Design a protein around this ligand. Sequence first.
Ligand code: HEM
Length: 152
Amino acid sequence: GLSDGEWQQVLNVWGKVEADIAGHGQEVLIRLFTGHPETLEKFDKFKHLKTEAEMKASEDLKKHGTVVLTALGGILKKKGHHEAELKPLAQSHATKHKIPIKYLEFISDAIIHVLHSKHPGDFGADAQGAMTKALELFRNDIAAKYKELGFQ
Ligand code: HEM
C-alpha cells in the first residue's frame, strides 16, 4: 500500500525506464541471469546463453526484456489496482513457467540495481524507497495467487 506521493515517485522513476525500455529490460534480465544462474534454466530459449557477451548480443533477450518491462509498467501505472493485469501473470508463472516467488524477489532487487547503475546519483533515497515498496506490493499479490494454487 503506497501513498500518492510514493506512487508519484514510482511513475517518475518509471519515466526513466520508458525513455529506453529495451535497454533497461535487457540489463535487468542480464543482472538476473548473472546474479542467479539457476534462473536462466527456466527459459528454454535463453538457456543456450552461457556468456554475458552472448546475453548482451541477444536481440531476442532485449525483445523479452521489452515484453517484461512493458508488462510491469502497465501494472505499475495502475497504482495498486492491478488485479486484472496481475492474475494472468501469476497464473502463467505458477502453472506454466513454474517460477518460484524467490525469483521474483531476485528480479525486484535486480531492477533496483539497474536503476542505480544507469542513473547514478539520479535515483534518490526517496525514489528507491517508493520503487522498492511498489515491487514488494507486486510480489506480495503474486504470492497470494501462488498460495491459492498451492504452488511452491
Ligand atoms: C517483473 C517481473 C516479471 C514480469 C512483469 C514478467 C512478465 C512476463 C510476460 C508478460 C511474459 C509473456 C507472457 C506470459 O508467459 O505470461 C513472461 C514470460 C516468461 N517469464 Fe516472466 N515476468 C517476470 C518475472 C519472471 C522471472 C523472475 C522469471 C524466471 C526467473 C520469469 C520467467 C518467464 C519465462 C520462462 C517466460 C516464458 C518465456 C518464453 O518462452 O517465451 N519471469 N513474463
